[PDB]
Amino acid sequence: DSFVIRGDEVRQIAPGQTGNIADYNYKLPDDFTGCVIAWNSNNLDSKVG
Amino acid sequence: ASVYAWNRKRISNCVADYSVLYNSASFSTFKCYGVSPTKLNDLCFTNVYA
């Protein structure tokens, strides 16, 4: 699975989490198996303005 | 106040929505002990003190 979010909301990407990303965008199951990988993409996904 | 003289507000005779608070960009840290923040909207208390 792949997507972009703000670095502050990365804490929501875990099994059994809550908050608007975990609630309304991307819900992991409580018994998830796998890895969550994230990196800062400010040099790639940000644009002036 | 200066922390040696810390303020207290007693909370009673009222309701609130807590769920927006730990979602809010207004706060740099949120924590709980003996309760889950997720559960607060289901609860009631004899008092709260802020």
CA B11 to chain centre: 10
Residue in B23, B24, B28 to test binding to A, most A beta-carbons within 10 Å: B23
**Which secondary structure element, helix H or strand E, spans residue A42, and what is its range?**
helix A42-45
CA atoms within a 13 Å half-sphere pointing along the CA-CB vector of B15: 5
Q: How far is A19 from chain B (nearest CA, A)?
A: 6
CA B18 to chain centre: 7
Hey, are the CB atoms on A20 and B38 less than 8 Å from each other?
A: no
Which residues are CB-neighbours of B27 under 8 A, at least 6 positions away? Answer: B21
Nearest chain B residue to A12 by CA: give it: B23
User: Resolution in A, one decimal?
Assistant: 3.6
Q: Which residues make beta-bridge pairs with B10?
A: B49
